[PDB]
């Protein structure tokens, strides 16, 4: 199986095969540690942000990949952005402070 | 290809700061602002920067120096353009 | 035991079932109570003059008969 | 300058209670109706759980009613039904609220194990619930009459108290009461009163609870939270798209369970509002209030009361607490673990032609993976008019696109991964090589690091998109840049099996072979002799060779001589680069020596020569192994001729001992051991018979009659070289195999007398089955056990990273050889290798500094120490490092995949945990559970006791269940008397002086003591030596470093004794504390500095305390963590690894360490 850009799950925006063009490989906790033992921060950021969970960063990346500019404008992963609303859905006020 | 980065790791000790410096330079080449400092074999910017590190003509000091110079090279051009903004008064 | 099903059944079970005579007692009490407020309403001059000013709007096509009285005795 | 008011880039995070007005800030409307969608037109009903007015447009940039459909119109709120036309994404963002008639308790603060409302009011839980259910009245602000402030009353009593006192007394019931209590509560005044009472009474029962409560109160005051906020006025509603109703095929609908819950909360709430304007009797509105309370509880966290069930489905509907919660905690980065684009996978194959730095990649996989790059590259050179035409081209697979792919593949590494990722070598970067076919080709030398067989294991590929990832992969994750295990400096790229059988067969010698005795000018004409068929691969021959020694100063010396060697070694010499001596290839080249060859090559010539060397060894190994024609036949396994006779003699012993049991000369138990013993000895006999015969029996002739050398028989060469097989497995093939064991753990006294070369009968196989099944079971279980251990390990360490350069302490541990009972179960050179000296070491004479103070000890320094007789070296360790919140690189060591000293910013904790965890599969008190017991500090079952203090001791009082031991120090005070149960046999001499930490009995001892009585260095030495015994007994090489970092994390916390700044008994960070008394030692108070006592916390216990709550919320119980943090208003600053991964930014280590540093200094500055 191989996938470049396929469909995405509705509940959480994540790679999911809808065409039988299979969703990408699942990057787990152990693989994160494997990246953590190496000094690779950007590989890890792109792994859990632009390549998967960021509904913005993914398209902003794709346009850069065809334009010839290798960069990432990561933003915040939609999983954590959803987790904020679930916490905030309770009586818990969770804010991002300072600047 | 570049099989081992060992020579670059000698030039800058950390080996993590190597990735950073080589990154910054690789974008200077990839986004077209500059050209290679050493013969390009069809090697992509990733490796061209590493060759530039191995030959010791590119690192964090040099880049910051080069960038710091370009600020005044551009500040010289716009000298009249921005001083014409005396309209602020 | 929490489980609010339990705290209701046990909370209501204290009230004793009404005897067939007791219902009429309470119902008689009801009659007294409302008629008191009815008579108390009957004793207000503005309550009358207001009803007058309202029926004058009914005959003037500024309202409808359904929005004021539900009918009299009969 | 002005700070900001819009989107910059946030640091930290804050958590606290939410005010009703604060909840109203988020709400863009009140949901007033249970309606969802219209039921025919599926549009949202206005003022309902799904509403376009409150939440957002159903479709992008289009009003619901349809009046404004144009993308130009944006900030317009439609005049018909107000909907601001904006992207539908905002329906995933905008929140809502619901205004509850009666107040309601928040289940999280009511039912959390230390009930927050309960201990905040100093009121029991059962009472609070009794008040919430309207089952009794509670007093509030009693004034001066008859009654306690928190006192609870019944029906008659409330009535009686009211007739007696009409006013100046107040009592309520239900939620309104608890809210009234919390609002009336003045925390500051309560604090003062509690401080006095703490001082007066001394009792453990009293002041434990006392100190716990005072901490909460003062924390809660500074927090900014006002108690009332634990009672919900306004209830937030989650955005609709996070709990969608979205349609499916066949016209059916599917929706999240929250709706069913949310719907309920509205209805009952609404009903209650109705019931207020109708003046319902008390018994009803109360029941309605209880029902509303129950419904809200089910919404927030279901399962703490009734576990309400969803519509038409038995399964309880999942609530918001269950959405966050799970296995384990937060799935947002728990296993497992989110789907990722630009990836793939398939079965993997060999590809021996590959260089170690590349890998075979299937054509189709590379096409679909690089699709955007191919698109971008196609129109950069102009082979495609536009991006669409480029898509059509690659979708048509026009022949021209293949060359463009060779360009984008060339310099662009790819990440390869296997299923059980353990250490960092589980992912390695390779250069793609376009390969026809659907299978992945993987360099043989790497197959060891992945533990990947070819029996159908699959591997996954990941594309490193951003430039930084390409340079990270190439300069960090690249295959050639990790040639050495991070666990120990030995190469993990060591040739595996076929290659080592080739080199073994290559440099070996038979007695007489073609070309024996002749002489050749050099390896070139040596190979020419062999390849032409004149000379045999193995024959004793003198040839002129030129070896090199760099023993000059940075300079390669050359010397030529006539070496006595074989033809194979001569040919092999062609590969050995430069300064290696010919001595290394002049031996038989087994798997052990062939590894140290690569190792020495790395430690001498550096990285680059070793890589190309390694490749060559593989290539030549495969080639020559193919020439050798090694095989395995049925006649390759030689059974001893004396086997049946040994069985018979061993068979006489059992019948001898049996006759002794029939006549009673020996007891039943003694018989079993006896018969079992004779059979065991027999097994050894057969093993050591076939081993001699198999090993040397090649008996051949050179010019004389006979001679005998090591056998050239195939299977022996396999086992001898180190390729595959071992004396145990060989013994099962030819000699008899073992004595199996019946399930209960006993061992059957009639062993398996046959082997695999012969047949096994019915019985022998059936008895063999248990060993197989227990093996598979044990391995499959010990696999799971190993993984769990690594989890606890990475949880307790993780954030530990090399931070400073040199902490500059002379402190360190004494490194000696392990010296167990015999000679050297492990040398000094291995224990001290790659570490740094604590202080300059002497020759036998002095004012001669061999190694000067703190210096990395490399191969030359270790050999110089070995030249001299030096038996002891003190070495800096990560446990004694003075740097707080990390380890200085100077104290760590050099160890890495590279030989240089550890870099600044490398994350050592992860690699430490991984290095310990990966081998745990091979382990088997004794075994892996023994290791787990060590890292958990657990006190043993029948422990010993150590002398509390030095000085003369004696026995005192009598038998009460403890016979007291009275210690008498010489100078110091006597008073220590320990209660020791006297029915445990003692050791300590009643009349002798015992030093503190002596043996007062026998049996294991708790490491808490060893830390306390013997000291920090003593306990860390004990752990490392004990845990290293377990692994080394199994043959696992793990450097002591990693174990030392785990230990440091165990002792992170300590408990203060004295005072003058903080509280007496508080357990607290020795980083924080030591940095506080070092700051206090000057300025401040002249010295008020407080004494602590280092503590030993088990790994699973020490990992519990973590400053960042987002990290704790992950692997711990989410509810408790969130609550316990939410009350204090705790502010998470990130700064760690786990938390930054959740939020999705750069890890504050490795490549990211530059960023965080640059950001950390910007903070708390101007
Ligand atoms: Mg397998
Ligand atoms: Zn409209
Ligand atoms: Zn240190």
Swiss-Prot record, chain A:
Q: Could you describe the post-translational modifications of this protein?
A: Acetylated on several lysine residues in the presence of glucose.
In biotechnology, how is it employed? Answer: Co-administration of salinamide and rifampicin or salinamide and myxopyronin suppresses the emergence of resistance to both antibiotics.
Please indicate which superkingdom the organism of origin belongs to. Bacteria
**What does the UniProt record say this protein does?**
DNA-dependent RNA polymerase (RNAP) catalyzes the transcription of DNA into RNA using the four ribonucleoside triphosphates as substrates.
* Quaternary structure and interacting proteins, as annotated: The RNAP catalytic core consists of 2 alpha, 1 beta, 1 beta' and 1 omega subunit. When a sigma factor is associated with the core the holoenzyme is formed, which can initiate transcription. The rRNA transcription and antitermination complex (rrnTAC) consists of RNAP, NusA, NusB, NusE (rpsJ), NusG, SubB, ribosomal protein S4, DNA and precursor rRNA; S4 is more flexible than other subunits. In pull-down experiments interacts with CedA. (Microbial infection) Interacts (via flap domain) with Escherichia phage lambda antitermination protein Q; this interaction renders bacterial RNAP resistant to transcription pausing and allows it to read through termination signals.
For this chain, the family text in UniProt reads: Belongs to the RNA polymerase beta chain family.
The entry's protein name is DNA-directed RNA polymerase subunit beta
Which organism is the protein's source?
Escherichia coli (strain K12)
Quick one: which gene encodes this? rpoB
Range covered out of full length: 1244 to 1342 of 1342
Curated annotation (Swiss-Prot), chain B:
Instruction: Name any one GO molecular function.
Output: DNA-directed RNA polymerase activity
Which Enzyme Commission number(s) are on file for it? 2.7.7.6
Which biological process annotations from GO are given for this protein?
bacterial-type flagellum assembly; bacterial-type flagellum-dependent cell motility; cell motility; cellular response to cell envelope stress; DNA-templated transcription initiation; intracellular iron ion homeostasis; nitrate assimilation; protein-containing complex assembly
Q: Which GO terms describe its cellular component?
A: cytosol; cytosolic DNA-directed RNA polymerase complex; RNA polymerase complex; transcription elongation factor complex
* InterPro entries, per the entry: DNA-dir_RNA_pol_omega (IPR003716), Pol_omega/Rpo6/RPB6 (IPR006110), RPB6/omega-like_sf (IPR036161)
Instruction: Alphabetically list the UniProt keywords.
Output: DNA-directed RNA polymerase, Nucleotidyltransferase, Transcription, Transferase
**Reaction catalysed by this enzyme:** RNA(n) + a ribonucleoside 5'-triphosphate = RNA(n+1) + diphosphate
- Describe, as the record does, how this protein assembles with itself and its partners: The RNAP catalytic core consists of 2 alpha, 1 beta, 1 beta' and 1 omega subunit. When a sigma factor is associated with the core the holoenzyme is formed, which can initiate transcription. The rRNA transcription and antitermination complex (rrnTAC) consists of RNAP, NusA, NusB, NusE (rpsJ), NusG, SubB, ribosomal protein S4, DNA and precursor rRNA; S4 is more flexible than other subunits.
Family in the record = Belongs to the RNA polymerase subunit omega family.
The identity of this protein, by name, is DNA-directed RNA polymerase subunit omega
Q: Give the taxonomic lineage as stored in the record.
A: Bacteria, Pseudomonadati, Pseudomonadota, Gammaproteobacteria, Enterobacterales
This protein's gene is called: rpoZ
Swiss-Prot record, chain C:
Compartment(s) of residence: Cytoplasm
Which superkingdom is the protein from? Bacteria
**Described purpose of this protein according to its UniProt entry:** Sigma factors are initiation factors that promote the attachment of RNA polymerase to specific initiation sites and are then released. This sigma factor is the primary sigma factor during exponential growth. Preferentially transcribes genes associated with fast growth, such as ribosomal operons, other protein-synthesis related genes, rRNA- and tRNA-encoding genes and prfB.
| Domains: entry comment | Contains 4 domains, connected by flexible linkers. In the active conformation, the domains are in an extended conformation, each making extensive interactions with the RNA polymerase catalytic core. In the autoinhibited state, sigma-70 factor domain-1 packs closely together with sigma-70 factor domains-2 and -4, contrary to the extended conformation that is seen when the protein is part of the RNA polymerase holoenzyme.
Q: Which family does it belong to?
A: Belongs to the sigma-70 factor family. RpoD/SigA subfamily.
Task: State what protein this is by name.
Answer: RNA polymerase sigma factor RpoD
> Per UniProt, what is the name of the gene that codes for the protein in this document?
rpoD
Q: Which residues of the full protein are shown?
A: 94 to 167 of 613
UniProtKB/Swiss-Prot annotation, chain D:
The cofactors named for this UniProt entry are:
Mg(2+); Zn(2+)
| EC number in record | 2.7.7.6
Q: Does the keyword Cell membrane apply?
A: no
Q: Which SMART domains match?
A: RPOLA_N
* Residues given in the record as Mg(2+) binding sites: 453, 455, 457
**In its keyword annotation, does this UniProt entry include Ribonucleoprotein?**
no
Q: What is it used for? A: Co-administration of salinamide and rifampicin or salinamide and myxopyronin suppresses the emergence of resistance to both antibiotics.
Single GO molecular-function term? zinc ion binding
Q: How is it modified after translation?
A: Acetylated on several lysine residues in the presence of glucose.
Free-text cofactor note: Binds 1 Mg(2+) ion per subunit. Binds 2 Zn(2+) ions per subunit.
Q: Give the consequence of mutating residue 775 to A/C.
A: Resistant to antibiotics salinamide A and B
Please provide the Gene Ontology terms (biological process) for this protein: bacterial-type flagellum assembly; bacterial-type flagellum-dependent cell motility; cell motility; cellular response to cell envelope stress; DNA-templated transcription initiation; intracellular iron ion homeostasis; nitrate assimilation; regulation of DNA-templated transcription elongation
State how changing residue 741 to E affects the protein, per the record: Resistant to antibiotics salinamide A and B
What stretch or stretches form a coiled coil here? none
Gene Ontology CC: one annotated term: cytoplasm
Annotated consequence of substituting residue 728 to T: Resistant to antibiotics salinamide A and B
- The UniProt record gives the binding positions of Zn(2+) 1 as 63, 65, 78, 81
Q: What does this protein do?
A: DNA-dependent RNA polymerase (RNAP) catalyzes the transcription of DNA into RNA using the four ribonucleoside triphosphates as substrates. Resistance to the antibiotics salinamide A, salinamide B, rifampicin, streptolydigin, CBR703, myxopyronin, and lipiarmycin can result from mutations in this protein.
Q: Which family does it belong to?
A: Belongs to the RNA polymerase beta' chain family.
Q: What is this protein called?
A: DNA-directed RNA polymerase subunit beta'
- Organism listed in the record: Escherichia coli (strain K12)
